[PDB]
Amino acid sequence: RQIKIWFRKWKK
Numbered sequence: 001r002q003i004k005i006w007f008r009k010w011k012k
Contacts, residue, residue, distance in 0.1 A: 006012045 010012055
């Protein structure tokens with residue numbers, strides 16, 4: 001749900 005570190009790795 002945070003999708004912030006993720007958005008920082010791939011391109012969520």
